[PDB]
Amino acid sequence: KSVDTLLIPGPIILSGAVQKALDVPSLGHTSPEFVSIFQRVLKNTRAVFKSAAASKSQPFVLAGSGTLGWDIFASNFILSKAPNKNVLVVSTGTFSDRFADCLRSYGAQVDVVRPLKIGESVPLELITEKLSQNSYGAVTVTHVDTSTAVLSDLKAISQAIKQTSPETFFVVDAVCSIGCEEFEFDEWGVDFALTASQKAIGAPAGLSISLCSSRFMDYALNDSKNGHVHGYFSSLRRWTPIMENYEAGKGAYFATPPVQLINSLDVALKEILEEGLHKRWDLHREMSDWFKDSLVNGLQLTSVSRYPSNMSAHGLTAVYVADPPDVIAFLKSHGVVIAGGIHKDIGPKYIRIGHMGVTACNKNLPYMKNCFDLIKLALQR
Amino acid sequence: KSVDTLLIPGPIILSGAVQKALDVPSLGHTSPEFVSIFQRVLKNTRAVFKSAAASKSQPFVLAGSGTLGWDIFASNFILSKAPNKNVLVVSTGTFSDRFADCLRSYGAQVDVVRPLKIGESVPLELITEKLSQNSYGAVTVTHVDTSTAVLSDLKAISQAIKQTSPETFFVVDAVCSIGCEEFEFDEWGVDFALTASQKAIGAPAGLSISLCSSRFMDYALNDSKNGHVHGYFSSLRRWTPIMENYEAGKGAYFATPPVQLINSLDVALKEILEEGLHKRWDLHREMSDWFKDSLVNGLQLTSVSRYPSNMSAHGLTAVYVADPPDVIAFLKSHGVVIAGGIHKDIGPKYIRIGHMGVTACNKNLPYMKNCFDLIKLALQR
Ligand SMILES: *Cc1c(COP(=O)(O)O)cnc(C)c1O
Ligand SMILES: *Cc1c(COP(=O)(O)O)cnc(C)c1O
Numbered sequence: 157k158s159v160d161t162l163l164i165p166g167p168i169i170l171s172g173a174v175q176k177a178l179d180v181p182s183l184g185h186t187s188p189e190f191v192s193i194f195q196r197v198l199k200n201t202r203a204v205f206k207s208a209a210a211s212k213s214q215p216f217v218l219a220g221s222g223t224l225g226w227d228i229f230a231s232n233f234i235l236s237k238a239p240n241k242n243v244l245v246v247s248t249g250t251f252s253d254r255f256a257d258c259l260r261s262y263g264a265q266v267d268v269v270r271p272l273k274i275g276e277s278v279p280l281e282l283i284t285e286k287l288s289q290n291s292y293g294a295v296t297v298t299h300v301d302t303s304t305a306v307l308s309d310l311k312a313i314s315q316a317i318k319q320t321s322p323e324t325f326f327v328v329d330a331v332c333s334i335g336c337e338e339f340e341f342d343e344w345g346v347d348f349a350l351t352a353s354q355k356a357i358g359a360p361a362g363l364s365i366s367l368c369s370s371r372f373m374d375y376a377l378n379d380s381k382n383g384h385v386h387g388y389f390s391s392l393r394r395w396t397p398i399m400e401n402y403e404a405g406k407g408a409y410f411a412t413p414p415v416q417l418i419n420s421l422d423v424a425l426k427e428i429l430e431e432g433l434h435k436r437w438d439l440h441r442e443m444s445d446w447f448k449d450s451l452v453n454g455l456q457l458t459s460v461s462r463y464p465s466n467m468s469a470h471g472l473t474a475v476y477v478a479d480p481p482d483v484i485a486f487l488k489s490h491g492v493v494i495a496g497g498i499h500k501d502i503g504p505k506y507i508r509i510g511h512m513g514v515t516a517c518n519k520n521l522p523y524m525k526n527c528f529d530l531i532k533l534a535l536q537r
Numbered sequence: 538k539s540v541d542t543l544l545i546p547g548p549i550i551l552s553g554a555v556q557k558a559l560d561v562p563s564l565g566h567t568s569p570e571f572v573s574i575f576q577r578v579l580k581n582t583r584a585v586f587k588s589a590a591a592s593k594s595q596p597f598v599l600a601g602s603g604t605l606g607w608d609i610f611a612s613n614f615i616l617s618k619a620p621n622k623n624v625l626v627v628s629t630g631t632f633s634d635r636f637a638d639c640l641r642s643y644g645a646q647v648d649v650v651r652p653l654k655i656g657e658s659v660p661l662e663l664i665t666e667k668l669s670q671n672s673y674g675a676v677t678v679t680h681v682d683t684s685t686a687v688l689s690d691l692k693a694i695s696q697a698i699k700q701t702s703p704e705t706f707f708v709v710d711a712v713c714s715i716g717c718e719e720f721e722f723d724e725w726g727v728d729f730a731l732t733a734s735q736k737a738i739g740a741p742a743g744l745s746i747s748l749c750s751s752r753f754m755d756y757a758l759n760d761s762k763n764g765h766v767h768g769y770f771s772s773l774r775r776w777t778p779i780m781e782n783y784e785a786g787k788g789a790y791f792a793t794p795p796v797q798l799i800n801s802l803d804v805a806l807k808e809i810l811e812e813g814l815h816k817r818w819d820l821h822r823e824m825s826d827w828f829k830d831s832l833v834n835g836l837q838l839t840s841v842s843r844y845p846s847n848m849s850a851h852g853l854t855a856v857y858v859a860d861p862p863d864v865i866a867f868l869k870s871h872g873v874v875i876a877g878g879i880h881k882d883i884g885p886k887y888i889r890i891g892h893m894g895v896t897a898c899n900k901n902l903p904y905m906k907n908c909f910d911l912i913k914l915a916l917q918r
Pocket of ligand 1: 683
């Protein structure tokens with residue numbers, strides 16, 4: 157027997173290079189050789205977000221998970237003397253909501269705008285409407301909500317913000333979009349974007365990867381004006397000098413970074429950048445279309461996210477099924493792991509499949525053809 | 538050429554088993570096989586702290602670094618309606634102080650008690666004195682401060698607390714003590730202990746490993762009384778159900794745990810437990826004595842921590858040297874990495890060496906004999 161094929165929306169299967177890049181002896185975090193690795197990582201992190209070094213945006217890579225990104229933004233936005241604590245949360249599913257929770261836990265007055273139906277993005281006009289009737293210090297959008305597998309139009313939302321409330325910070329939960337979905341940090345005027353290491357970036361789990369715009373960084377570190385951070389580990393003020401030195405190939409110290417994880421992430425970022433982001437987004441699209449096509453049209457199923465449509469993310473598939481547990485158990489027995497629903501409402505009414513990174517790209521891995529064949533067979537009983 | 542020999546106080550060299558335990562394909566975090574790994578890890582985590590399952594203490598293993606442990610304790614102690622926000626910090630070096638900072642950043646009124654001289658522990662009578670003239674909600678002690686390489690007598694301090702202020706929570710920063718220093722969670726009445734994965738535990742960097750006493754857990758989750766956590770990722774309230782299920786071999790989800798890191802930690806914990814904690818503490822002692830003996834007596838150097846004495850930790854050595862940079866550079870050139878000072882005062886006046894985990898135990902690794910030979914030669918010029 158072998159290891160099961162991971163086809164859930166994070167963690168995902170790692171390419172050989174990034175996986176064996178984990179099995180490496182420990183390096184001192186301030187050693188010249190580790191400093192080399194992290195420097196590349198920080199610069200490739202901004203690149204992967206589609207941010208130019210000239211934008212003066214500040215990248216942050218630290219031990220934690222995607223979720224840390226929420227704490228980081230909240231803790232650095234809702235400072236002690238925060239002038240505007242109102243945040244407007246654009247919800248497309250479970251994670252948007254959980255982000256809303258995190259926000260509130262930090263002292264932010266949160267407003268939630270939702271879609272007209274589950275599996276859809278929030279209407280743009282409703283977002284601008286909300287952006288007008290009130291003045292939010294920040295607005296969040298979950299680029300791809302993994303619970304509903306819904307894709308939000310960041311280009312549109314970013315323009316509505318620039319148009320209706322330019323001063324409000326544009327925060328994007330890109331955990332399940334960076335690496336497989338078109339995402340333009342600089343172009344779309346994103347102030348804070350956060351992603352994880354185990355989704356489309358194709359790295360091991362254990363890292364929080366976020367990026368700060370010059371504008372937000374300007375706000376976050378203005379102690380005399382906005383006050384201080386009610387926290388510590390998540391303090392941008394404390395980590396900036398560290399990320400700065402590392403990018404300058406200097407090496408300093410606040411909290412020991414995950415050397416093995418950073419080494420792995422180094423390879424993972426190179427791989428997505430060596431072949432090109434656009435190319436990598438197209439592969440995910442091709443994979444996603446073929447698969448939903450097979451599921452929705454081929455097996456006459458219904459997608460949780462509207463399909464076909466630009467509302468359906470390319471990093472995963474969420475399709476309703478009669479008996480999700482049975483389908484999941486069936487695939488499991490045959491060496492394939494897919495996921496359940498995780499959603500306050502439709503939770504046990506559907507299943508979720510991965511198809512990100514090497515499993516989406518790299519047309520030699522039969523992972524997905526086999527996945528579909530199995531689901532196909534699972535619905536036979 | 539080869540990889541340099543890591544002889545700094547964290548990260549440390551990993552044994553072959555735990556290192557290759559990193560290079561493993563990703564598992565779904567709720568998959569039966571991963572649930573198996575994490576369950577063992579959580580139970581061996583309490584074991585490694587010397588806590589009996591019967592104590593009902595709750596372990597926490599999450600993505601982050603030792604430093605997260607501070608945020609976790611602070612965030613869960615200084616709740617919204619915290620009845621006693623006063624914390625007494627027992628400082629033996631830089632980290633005690635930084636912990637003090639973290640504490641203040643979270644809203645705690647901190648008092649700092651220090652040693653009479655650098656390289657010494659704080660006098661016990663001064664601690665009880667301070668514990669009497671005021672009533673602290675909690676007191677922290679850095680079991681081994683890596684900046685000064687000082688060891689505090691937890692047995693003594695724990696009795697002074699039980700004696701002078703039993704209600705005050707006993708918090709221990711065990712980041713550089715668990716795995717190489719005698720540490721009794723249950724026996725000494727520790728309420729919150731935090732450690733990291735890269736020190737004496739001999740695991741890769743990237744995990745925060747802490748343990749909560751039934752008593753503290755009682756306080757931390759009493760929302761109606763003490764209020765809520767001003768935070769999210771560090772909320773014990775949010776992670777408890779997760780650690781609980783995992784220990785029950787159930788598997789649930791709050792924030793994706795570092796599957797590869799947990800797998801590695803699994804092996805690392807087994808190894809220290811398979812040979813026995815006491816045995817593992819003696820090996821560290823033997824190694825530490827031999828090495829400081831060689832440095833202090835052999836090369837007539839002066840330890841930053843009082844030596845010989847019970848104030849000198851066994852996980853590292855901090856010795857003053859004429860030209861630290863030169864000694865460090867010299868060792869580096871010959872494939873060995875030791876560290877600088879990191880201390881507000883004596884910072885550039887000394888060096889630091891590791892000797893923890895496989896490099897301290899496993900009497901086949903010539904790492905330390907060679908380290909000394911090199912320092913010996915470094916002082917020849
Ligand atoms: C190494 C160390 C820390 C910091 O641990 P990180 O893993 O770098 O966050 C905190 N306390 C002590 C006593 C240490 O030795
Ligand atoms: C997977 C995911 C998260 C949580 O990431 P962790 O790494 O589990 O903390 C947050 N947001 C979205 C949109 C996700 O898909």
